[PDB]
Amino acid sequence: SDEMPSECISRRELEKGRISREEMETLSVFRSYEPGEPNCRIYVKNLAKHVQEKDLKYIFGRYVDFSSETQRIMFDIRLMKEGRMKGQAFIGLPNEKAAAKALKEANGYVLFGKPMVVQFARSARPKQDPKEGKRK
């Protein structure tokens, strides 16, 4: 592989920017939004103006084994840079377990001072759900 930089976020750094349900059902940024549902895709609100989709790779690509093509092939990020939906993002992950983990760890993350609102993907129109890449 020769794609993305050879550093992604450590759990001890990610865990500094995180909330419980006890703050979540208190925060105005969480007023209608809840984690933990089964989906291989996740999406985020309240990203910084200070950031691009090419930077969100640093955290969200932590859950993708980049030495294996079958993982990173199913991974990509777009950030909504402007309009009435500015500072929103979509991320497909290689597994619904990787999304379950990443929702438990990324949710509340204080990127550029701003607490990111990490959720299961709200709607998308594929034909079929994915599977495990190694021998399934």
Swiss-Prot record:
Summary of the tissues where the protein is detected: Highly expressed in pancreas and kidney. Detected at lower levels in heart, brain, placenta, lung, liver, spleen, thymus, prostate, testis, ovary, small intestine, colon and leukocytes.
Gene Ontology annotations of biological process type: mRNA splicing, via spliceosome; RNA splicing
Domain of life: Eukaryota
Keywords, comma-separated and alphabetical: Disease variant, Dwarfism, mRNA processing, mRNA splicing, Nucleus, Phosphoprotein, Repeat, RNA-binding, Spliceosome
Domain RRM: start-end pairs: 40-123
Intracellular or extracellular location(s): Nucleus
Keyword Nucleus among record annotations: yes
Subunit structure: Component of the U11/U12 snRNPs that are part of the U12-type spliceosome. Found in a complex with m(7)G-capped U12 snRNA. Interacts with PDCD7.
Task performed by this protein: Participates in pre-mRNA U12-dependent splicing, performed by the minor spliceosome which removes U12-type introns. U12-type introns comprises less than 1% of all non-coding sequences. Binds to the 3'-stem-loop of m(7)G-capped U12 snRNA.
Implicated disorder: Pituitary hormone deficiency, combined or isolated, 7: An autosomal recessive deficiency of growth hormone characterized by severe postnatal growth failure, delayed bone age without bone dysplasia, and hypoplasia of the anterior pituitary.
Designated name of the protein: RNA-binding region-containing protein 3
Protein encoded by which gene: RNPC3
